[PDB]
Design a protein around this ligand. Structure first.
Ligand SMILES: *O[C@H]1[C@@H](O)[C@H](n2cnc3c(=O)[nH]c(N)nc32)O[C@@H]1COP(=O)(O)OP(=O)(O)OP(=O)(O)O
Ligand SMILES: *O[C@H]1[C@@H](O)[C@H](n2cnc3c(=O)[nH]c(N)nc32)O[C@@H]1COP(=O)(O)OP(=O)(O)OP(=O)(O)O
Ligand SMILES: [Mg+2]
Lengths: 203, 206
RNA sequence: AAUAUAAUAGUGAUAUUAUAUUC
RNA sequence: AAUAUAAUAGUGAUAUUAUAUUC
């Protein structure tokens, strides 16, 4: 199949990656978005920020915490880009929302509050952009076609759906029951433990 | 002995107290450095725990807020009492200890601002603390008694009873930090030592 | 803590991440 | 968790804080 033709989501979130790496661009004294290359880069950067040293140790702690947080948010945004490449944009948005929910649960950090604030500024525009039926990815459409045809021919069909990541497991889990056309499907989840006659039609 | 002269420290701390009180009085509708104020601020703190709103998260933030404000108010009060029974440096060290422990636990939006408001009066407070004219007459008289009694008898085992642990640490630091009391080697006895407190031991006063 | 697989970077020993398993 | 003492409001049972102790 074909990749989705236009990213509004990535267009605006590349601005949050840019603004976050601009914030990082304030404190630093010193590649494509949505790829594994950027993940490797941001991980190596995160490991590079830990070894930076100053005579004042507390200031050092402040800016190191800052850099760690910035690179972390960057990583999560990247993850969102990928997730929405392989799934709905609602799933990526909800990934980020889960992320910031956890962050809010952690405690109030000046940096975290800032970043979450700048994210919340773009939230309306974002949810505006994934509620539209126009933006549904070609891959999920084709998958929907396959499932529809196969279950039309054989309603008793048992399916098993393999995906690379657990995030995508949750993503398609929600995508199936969030899809009116797929209503004949009774999804189920199979993953690992770590950090026909029944009614589950698809696993 | 008479109570202290004029307290600039108490004036500053009082202003901070009524400012914090203004922060707390924004939401809801007897002097400073007294036990009465302590009972009052306790009952008030308990009254803020009954505060209820249809919105539970905003309620959470508000009750947390009032808890923080009442807490800092309490600590201010205690600091005033300590300054009354001891050096001003002891009170400022008490407050510094408190705010340090507050910093270590992580900063809420509000605690950061309270710490910020304390920080600006910190320089003036210390400026008052380093002022010799402001010294406590109680400690004057105590120092006098110790001086006389140890002058007449160079070997004297003293035991000094005080009300609170804060005064124990305060008077320990006061004895260790007084040039006139240099003949003293203080020691501490509190609740949850004695063999070194003898006449042949390392401790003259306990 | 160890192990396997996959993608990515590197000529490669490797490295990062993802996934799974074991002790 | 219980017990004692002190200060404090209440006429008082009590209550708050402080101090100390015990299981
Ligand atoms: O260095 C490791 C290791 O010493 C110890 N550890 C944790 N789980 C195991 C295990 O299954 N087998 C062995 N031999 N050793 C183990 O913990 C250290 C690291 O702690 P982690 O934070 O990685 O462990 P945690 O439980 O938080 O994560 P995970 O085990 O689920 O992946
Ligand atoms: O309700 C109390 C009680 O059940 C239990 N507890 C704590 N200390 C004791 C004790 O010495 N003897 C008995 N019988 N029971 C005890 O803990 C509950 C309350 O916990 P706390 O936070 O008050 O106890 P903590 O250790 O944190 O403080 P402290 O009393 O030792 O100073
Ligand atoms: Mg005292």
């Amino acid at each position: 199949v074909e990749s989705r033709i236009s990213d509004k989501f990535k267009y605006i979130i590349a601005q949050l990656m840019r603004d976050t790496e601009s914030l990082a661009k304030r404190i630093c004294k010193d590649r494509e978005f949505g790829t594994q290359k950027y993940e490797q880069w941001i991980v190596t950067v995160q490991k590079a920020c830990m070894v930076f040293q100053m005579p004042d140790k507390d200031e050092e702690s402040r800016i190191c915490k800052a850099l760690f947080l910035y690179t972390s948010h960057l990583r999560k945004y990247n993850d969102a880009l990928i997730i929405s490449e392989h799934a709905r944009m609602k799933d990526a948005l909800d990934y980020l929302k889960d992320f910031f929910s956890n962050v809010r649960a952690a405690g109030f950090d000046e940096i975290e509050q800032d970043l979450t604030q700048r994210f919340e500024e773009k939230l309306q525009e974002l949810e505006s952009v994934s509620r539209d039926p126009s933006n549904e990815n070609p891959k999920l459409e084709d998958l929907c076609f396959i499932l529809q045809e196969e279950y039309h021919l054989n309603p008793e069909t048992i399916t098993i759906l393999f995906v690379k990541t657990r995030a995508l497991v949750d993503a398609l889990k929600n995508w199936i029951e969030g899809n009116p056309k797929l209503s004949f499907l009774k999804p189920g989840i199979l993953t690992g433990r770590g950090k026909a006659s029944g009614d589950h039609n698809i696993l | 002995v008479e109570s202290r002269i004029s307290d600039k420290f108490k004036y500053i701390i009082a202003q901070l107290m009524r400012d914090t009180e203004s922060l707390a009085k924004r939401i809801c509708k007897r002097e400073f450095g007294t036990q009465k104020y302590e009972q009052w601020i306790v009952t008030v703190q308990k009254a803020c725990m009954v505060f209820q709103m249809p919105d539970k998260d905003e309620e959470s933030r508000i009750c947390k807020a009032l808890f923080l404000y009442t807490s800092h108010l309490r600590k201010y009060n205690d600091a005033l009492i300590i300054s009354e029974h001891a050096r001003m440096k002891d009170a400022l060290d008490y407050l510094k200890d408190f705010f340090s422990n507050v910093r270590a636990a992580g900063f809420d939006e509000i605690e950061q601002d309270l710490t910020q408001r304390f920080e600006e009066k910190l320089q003036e407070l210390e400026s008052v603390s380093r002022d010799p004219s402001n010294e406590n007459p109680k400690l004057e008289d105590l120092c006098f008694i110790l001086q006389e009694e140890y002058h007449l008898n160079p070997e004297t085992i003293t035991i000094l009873f005080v009300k609170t642990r804060a005064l124990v640490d305060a008077l320990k630091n006061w004895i260790e930090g007084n040039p006139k009391l240099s003949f003293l080697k203080p020691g501490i006895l509190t609740g949850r030592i004695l063999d070194a407190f003898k006449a042949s031991g390392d401790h003259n006063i306990l």
